[PDB]
């Protein structure tokens, strides 16, 4: 699944 960092979702 996507991962969230600092409010935004990304693959890695």
């Amino acid at each position: 699944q996507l991962i969230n960092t600092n409010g935004s979702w990304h693959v890695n």
Partner: antibody, heavy 118, light 112 residues
């Protein structure tokens, strides 16, 4: 089947620290994103932040300086601390989980009132 | 900062009729081909309940009288046919642009 429940003082004095706990049952806090949200007397909802399954955190910039979200996986609980509160921090506080099934805040506690007042 | 604008501020609908509520974002809430825009229902004394996730998907336990559509910046929630249990305030929420926010709410009143 996951359940969340907020607890902690209903009254905090201006300038002190507000602390709440979220107790989680029927799943483990080492998967998902574990959030706090609050609803002002005027009814507006404000997102506060999360601690994720890895221990990483995300805080609303409006609060980043005063907030901390932590966890204890041996108790399956996570915690909010909000420093230096004012009467503007009176609200109903909720914990909620986001899973990657929906990427949305999909399970919520019933919420707990915290009033900040002398 | 990103804002979500809901309209109308409130509306009154007869039983069996259709309610349409709008949520417009000031910038795109899409990423990875998803729109990170969700809809909640909230009634007094209760937490928000998730109705629609990623703009158009019904959550489990929500009836197909609810639907959402839209992408990027413009979104709609429709309730059709409305029922008495639908008297509540509805909110949109976006969780892909810092800071995460909710719309201001739209209150649905049921005529009788």
């Amino acid at each position: 089947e996951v359940q969340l429940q907020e607890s902690g003082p209903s009254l905090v004095k201006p300038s002190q620290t507000l602390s709440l706990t979220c107790s989680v049952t029927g799943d483990s806090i080492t998967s998902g994103y574990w959030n706090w949200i609050r609803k002002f007397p005027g009814n507006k909802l404000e997102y506060m932040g999360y601690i994720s399954y890895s221990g990483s955190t995300y805080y609303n910039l409006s609060l980043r300086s005063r907030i901390s979200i932590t966890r204890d996986t041996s108790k399956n609980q996570y915690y909010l601390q909000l420093n230096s509160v004012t009467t503007e921090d009176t609200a109903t506080y909720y914990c909620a989980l986001i899973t990657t099934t929906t990427y949305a805040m999909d399970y919520w506690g019933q919420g707990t009132s915290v009033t900040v007042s002398s | 900062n990103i804002v979500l604008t809901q309209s109308p501020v409130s509306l009154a609908v007869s039983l069996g009729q259709r309610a349409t509520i709008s949520c417009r974002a000031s910038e795109s809430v899409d990423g990875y081909g998803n729109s990170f825009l969700h809809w909640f229902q909230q009634k007094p004394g209760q937490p928000p309940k998730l109705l629609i996730y990623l703009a158009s998907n019904l959550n489990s336990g929500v009836p197909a009288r609810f639907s959402g559509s839209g992408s990027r910046t413009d979104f709609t929630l429709t309730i059709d046919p409305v029922e008495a249990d639908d008297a509540a305030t509805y909110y949109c929420q976006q969780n892909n642009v810092d800071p995460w926010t909710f719309g201001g709410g739209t209150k649905l009143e049921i005529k009788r």
